[PDB]
Amino acid sequence: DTICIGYHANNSTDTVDTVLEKNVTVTHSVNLLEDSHNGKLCRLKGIAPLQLGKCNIAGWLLGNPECDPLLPVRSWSYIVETPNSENGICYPGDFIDYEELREQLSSVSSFERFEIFPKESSWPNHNTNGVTAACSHEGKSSFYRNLLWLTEKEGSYPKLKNSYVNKKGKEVLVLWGIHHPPNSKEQQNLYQNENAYVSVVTSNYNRRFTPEIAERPKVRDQAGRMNYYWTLLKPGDTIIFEANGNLIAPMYAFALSRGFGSGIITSNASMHECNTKCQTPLGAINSSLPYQNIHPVTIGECPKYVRSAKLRMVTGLRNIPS
């Protein structure tokens, strides 16, 4: 009569590494590293992302004509740019503190596009029909949907001074532009004053802009330049524009709402009818595992990114079916 003591064994082919030995076949084990995604852009906690289509942030914010127009009000969980964004700034020039603006938009969860300065109504004694071929649409020369190219009317550019009081109860993103002709002849033909200036003030913002005329290499067949500026007008505060030339005036502005967990990602994937808690530029992750090796860029509640190819924890025994 005999009794023996022994241990479990099974057919498993799971292998784990240890310090003293690599590649040990074990009976049981747990994988801690997520490596699978669904290859789709999804809703994040039930909220769809903001897709900019053919535009980047600049093209969308300035109102590039080539980009399909979005609904007046939007709410999102994250912003998606496409890698090949052909439509951005269409009239050559610098967009000041653009990166800072993107970083601001990274915590915005909603916008309302509203007419801050109505077209035919706000700039009397000035022309508002200025267009350009650098910003073409359907072949014809056009211009930014959110801005207005003010020029001389009937041989004169009278000093304008207009203002907006923010009664939206939220921050209002106001954008404008400053035009820089390549010569003084064009400066006179457009704004009738060689010593022009633009002034923009709020309670906490205070800037003055002066035309700087010089011949420049052609960009998008333009020797002139256009510098783009922006400011966030606090609730209740007032913004004042004052100019006698060169002002690319605001026409539409954005009432903004703040949120958490958002961000801007560059992605190729397509939006699908699906929901997730974790979104990467390559696809959505549905996992409760502590690590992932899919992508460093994550939106939502995601596992920690690591470079590892394998993170497998043994729980069972050294497997010896022999």
Binding site: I5, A9, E99, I320
Partner: protein
């Protein structure tokens, strides 16, 4: 292993023991068979469950983390942001891989120890009423029916009850 049982003086595992990690095999007149030890298996499961769960718990939820952009005159800040991201990534990859290796080693050792401890528990219960025939087995110096076997398995083996007969067979 560290305690010398698994892949040691007990060469291999039992595909035939399907209801636990550690267990017994017996052979007597009534027949033979496998029966796992639940007290030890359930202790090991509790332990390793708590180990896995802590490895998961120590890693917090990774909330939103996306890239930033910098203009052509902010190369230093761009490289510093990159330096930060790469540093943190190195450190976490290192930490994860190392923790998994260490804990794997300790887990195999833990199992080895459980098997050895079970063996020793049985040995100390049986004393000289049986002999160690190697490979983790005991040969009784007396008849051990199903009831006797079960008394051994649930830790209530009655040594004096079989001491005489065993002494006689051992001679």
């Amino acid at each position: 292993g560290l305690f010398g049982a698994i892949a040691g003086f007990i060469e291999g595992g039992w595909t035939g023991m399907i209801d636990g990690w550690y267990g017994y095999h017996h052979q007597n007149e009534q027949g033979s068979g496998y029966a796992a030890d639940q007290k030890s298996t359930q202790n090991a499961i509790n332990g390793i469950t708590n180990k896995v769960n802590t490895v998961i718990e120590k890693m917090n939820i990774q909330f939103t983390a996306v890239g930033k952009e910098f203009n052509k005159l902010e190369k230093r800040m761009e490289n510093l942001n990159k330096k930060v991201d790469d540093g943190f990534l190195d450190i976490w990859t290192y930490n994860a891989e190392l923790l998994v290796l260490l804990e794997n080693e300790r887990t195999l050792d833990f199992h080895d120890s459980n098997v050895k401890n079970l063996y020793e528990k049985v040995k100390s219960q049986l004393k000289n009423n049986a002999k160690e025939i190697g490979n983790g087995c005991f040969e009784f110096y007396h008849k051990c029916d199903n009831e006797c076997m079960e008394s051994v398995r649930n830790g209530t083996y009655d040594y004096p009850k079989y001491s005489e007969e065993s002494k006689l067979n051992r001679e």
